[PDB]
């Protein structure tokens, strides 16, 4: 009877509404993010959009700033609002301080907005967990995960959404310094990690690749096709 109000503590000190909100993140398309020496990758699964609908308006990977991009899970309605507020915050931070918004700062602001929305009644928590990754450190790659609760964390490689447990288990046992020593191997690692969660053909994986002092490069289906062909060749070599 303690799960009907955000600001009500359960006898064991649980804010049950936030835990329920995380369940919303548990129901979204998987997002995998791994950062390399000179590359940050945001893996995503496409949901095989309807035969008669356009996929241009189903963008799940969006860039908050010119060099910071985020991939979210959970309900799209809240994710869009969070993304818009993050963009406005980045453009305001640039305005007040000319230095471009750091990935840490944008993640902190997203967490602050989520916490403010999960602090009092009459305001439902944001049911989207955002993986904010960017080279905004001016020579250092960073990746962050903003839980629907409001806490963020620095992750070398983390998974959100459906299958997050399996993708995280794969990433832990395969993400080594030898793995991400080059951009191509980092992209291959992202593809391999997302393959176990999303069993399907091409166009079911959208990869956002960002290099140092560059712009977001949403890889075309062919390039993902080339990388999957390479991974299949590697598997054939192993056998």
């Amino acid at each position: 009877s303690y799960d009907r109000a955000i600001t009500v503590f359960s006898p064991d000190g649980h804010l049950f509404q936030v835990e329920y909100a995380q369940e919303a993140v548990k129901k979204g398309s998987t997002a995998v993010g791994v950062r390399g020496r000179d590359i940050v990758v945001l893996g995503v699964e496409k949901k095989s959009v309807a035969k008669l609908q356009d996929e241009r308006t189903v963008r799940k990977i969006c860039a908050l700033d010119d060099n910071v991009c985020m991939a979210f899970a959970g309900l799209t309605a809240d994710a869009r609002i969070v993304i818009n507020r993050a963009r406005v915050e980045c453009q305001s931070h640039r305005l007040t301080v000319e230095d471009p918004v750091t990935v840490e700062y944008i993640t902190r602001y997203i967490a602050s907005l989520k916490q403010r929305y999960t602090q009092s009644n009459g305001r439902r928590p944001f049911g989207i967990s955002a993986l904010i990754v960017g080279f905004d450190f001016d020579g250092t790659p960073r990746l962050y995960q903003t839980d629907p609760s409001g806490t963020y964390h620095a992750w070398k490689a983390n998974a959100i959404g459906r299958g997050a447990k399996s993708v995280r288990e794969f990433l832990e046992k395969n993400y080594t310094d030898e793995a991400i020593e080059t951009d191509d191997l980092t992209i291959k690692l992202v593809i391999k990690a997302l393959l176990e969660v999303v069993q399907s053909g091409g166009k079911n994986i959208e990869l956002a690749v960002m290099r140092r002092d560059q712009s977001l490069k949403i890889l075309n289906p062919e390039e993902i096709e080339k990388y999957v062909v390479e991974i299949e060749k590697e598997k054939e070599e192993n056998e």
Partner: protein, 248 residues
């Protein structure tokens, strides 16, 4: 239960009120829109066809938002009217600040943001209005957009919302030729879909409303088909059905 208010999250993480609204959107009358290579169109069903009801506006379900946009409606009447007024206000505000037509998706996103804000802040019931958007912009041209009570929109080539939306959408998927539909063919397909989307046989012209978006000499004329052309299309569909049954 976990549907006392919109703000409440179910243990599985579902906005029960939002789902209830998106289910209730089915009570609304059938409306559909097919995107054609030369334009897009909308089709709606007048549920109220009483003889004592005087048709004064002719656009109960299809509203003009801007000089290059129009959006059909489906859902509560008061919510639909508020949403259409807000759409007009947003479009004209964008025109005043930027002095160019809203690129359609901007208006759709603004309305979806308003609906999301309603579904988030406590003390407000979700807008139970799902309305199809049509229009042309310099960036992508003709587009058809679907808006749900939850603020989740999406580009679509042909969709139907309201009564028997599932059957209409499925059989539009079955017989929609991508990139090969002209406005005449689009109207023919829309009439074919509306014929069996509603239980009423013979698809009375007074009981169906069709509006078409065309790009003529850079004007974007929105035309609501008069009863004469609607009757002509109905007769054409009847003759086509007779020809098809000829094989029998």
């Amino acid at each position: 239960r976990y549907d006392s208010r919109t703000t409440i999250f179910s243990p599985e993480g579902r906005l029960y009120q939002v789902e209830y609204a998106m289910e209730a959107i089915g009570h609304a009358g059938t409306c559909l829109g097919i995107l054609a290579n030369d334009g897009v169109l909308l089709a709606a069903e007048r549920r109220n066809i009483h003889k004592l009801l005087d048709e004064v506006f002719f656009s109960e379900k299809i509203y003009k938002l801007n000089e290059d946009m129009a959006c059909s409606v489906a859902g509560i009447t008061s919510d639909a009217n508020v949403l259409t007024n807000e759409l007009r206000l947003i479009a004209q505000r964008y025109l005043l600040q930027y002095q160019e037509p809203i690129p359609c998706e901007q208006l759709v996103t603004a309305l979806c943001d308003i609906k999301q804000a309603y579904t988030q802040f406590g003390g407000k019931r979700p807008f139970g209005v799902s309305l199809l958007y049509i229009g042309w912009d310099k960036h992508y041209g003709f587009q058809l957009y679907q808006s749900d009570p939850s603020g989740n929109y999406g580009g679509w080539k042909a969709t139907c919302i309201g009564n028997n939306s599932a059957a209409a959408v499925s059989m539009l998927k079955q017989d929609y030729k991508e990139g090969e539909m002209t406005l005449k063919s689009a109207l023919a397909l829309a009439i074919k879909v509306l014929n069996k989307t509603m239980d009423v046989s013979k698809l009375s012209a007074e009981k169906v409303e069709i509006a078409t978006l065309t790009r003529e000499n850079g004007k974007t004329v929105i035309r609501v088909l008069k009863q004469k052309e609607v009757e002509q299309l109905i007769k054409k569909h009847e003759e086509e059905e007779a020809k098809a049954e000829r094989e029998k």
